[PDB]
CSV table of N, CA and C in Angstrom, one decimal:
chain,number,residue,atom,x,y,z
A,1,UNK,N,120.5,91.2,104.2
A,1,UNK,CA,120.1,90.6,105.4
A,1,UNK,C,118.7,90.1,105.4
A,2,UNK,N,117.9,90.7,104.5
A,2,UNK,CA,116.5,90.3,104.4
A,2,UNK,C,116.1,89.8,102.9
A,3,UNK,N,115.1,89.0,102.8
A,3,UNK,CA,114.7,88.5,101.5
A,3,UNK,C,114.4,89.6,100.5
A,4,UNK,N,113.2,89.5,100.0
A,4,UNK,CA,112.7,90.5,99.0
A,4,UNK,C,111.9,91.6,99.8
A,5,UNK,N,111.9,91.6,101.1
A,5,UNK,CA,111.2,92.6,101.8
A,5,UNK,C,109.7,92.6,101.5
A,6,UNK,N,109.1,91.5,101.6
A,6,UNK,CA,107.7,91.3,101.3
A,6,UNK,C,106.8,92.1,102.2
A,7,UNK,N,105.9,92.8,101.6
A,7,UNK,CA,104.9,93.7,102.2
A,7,UNK,C,103.7,92.9,102.8
A,8,UNK,N,103.3,93.3,104.0
A,8,UNK,CA,102.2,92.7,104.7
A,8,UNK,C,101.2,93.8,105.1
A,9,UNK,N,99.9,93.6,104.9
A,9,UNK,CA,98.9,94.6,105.2
A,9,UNK,C,97.8,94.2,106.2
A,10,UNK,N,98.1,94.1,107.4
A,10,UNK,CA,97.1,93.7,108.5
A,10,UNK,C,95.9,94.7,108.5
A,11,UNK,N,96.2,95.9,108.1
A,11,UNK,CA,95.1,96.9,108.0
A,11,UNK,C,95.6,98.1,107.3
A,12,UNK,N,94.8,98.5,106.3
A,12,UNK,CA,95.1,99.7,105.4
A,12,UNK,C,93.8,100.3,104.9
A,13,UNK,N,92.8,100.3,105.8
A,13,UNK,CA,91.5,100.8,105.5
A,13,UNK,C,90.6,99.6,105.1
A,14,UNK,N,91.3,98.4,105.1
A,14,UNK,CA,90.8,97.1,104.8
A,14,UNK,C,89.7,96.8,105.8
A,15,UNK,N,89.9,97.4,107.0
A,15,UNK,CA,89.1,97.2,108.1
A,15,UNK,C,87.6,97.4,107.8
A,16,UNK,N,87.3,98.5,107.1
A,16,UNK,CA,85.9,98.8,106.6
A,16,UNK,C,85.4,100.1,107.2
A,17,UNK,N,85.7,101.2,106.5
A,17,UNK,CA,85.2,102.5,106.8
A,17,UNK,C,84.9,102.7,108.3
A,18,UNK,N,85.8,102.5,109.2
A,18,UNK,CA,85.6,102.6,110.6
A,18,UNK,C,85.0,104.0,110.9
A,19,UNK,N,85.5,105.0,110.2
A,19,UNK,CA,85.0,106.3,110.4
A,19,UNK,C,83.6,106.4,109.8
A,20,UNK,N,82.6,106.4,110.7
A,20,UNK,CA,81.3,106.5,110.2
A,20,UNK,C,80.9,107.9,109.7
A,21,UNK,N,80.5,108.1,108.5
A,21,UNK,CA,80.1,109.5,108.1
A,21,UNK,C,79.1,109.9,109.2
A,22,UNK,N,79.0,111.2,109.5
A,22,UNK,CA,78.0,111.5,110.6
A,22,UNK,C,76.6,111.2,110.2
A,23,UNK,N,76.0,110.4,111.1
A,23,UNK,CA,74.6,110.1,110.9
A,23,UNK,C,73.7,111.0,111.7
A,24,UNK,N,74.3,111.7,112.7
A,24,UNK,CA,73.6,112.6,113.6
A,24,UNK,C,73.0,113.8,112.8
A,25,UNK,N,73.8,114.3,111.9
A,25,UNK,CA,73.3,115.4,111.1
A,25,UNK,C,72.1,115.1,110.3
A,26,UNK,N,72.0,113.8,110.0
A,26,UNK,CA,70.9,113.2,109.2
A,26,UNK,C,69.5,113.4,109.9
A,27,UNK,N,69.6,113.3,111.3
A,27,UNK,CA,68.3,113.4,112.0
A,27,UNK,C,67.6,114.7,111.8
A,28,UNK,N,68.4,115.8,111.6
A,28,UNK,CA,67.8,117.1,111.4
A,28,UNK,C,66.9,117.5,112.6
């Protein structure tokens, strides 16, 4: 019913490290 089932990746971490490493600890 479907072609080759082509994969699409709108987002797979491609977005850019959204999770910021904690910078607050850095302040000390």
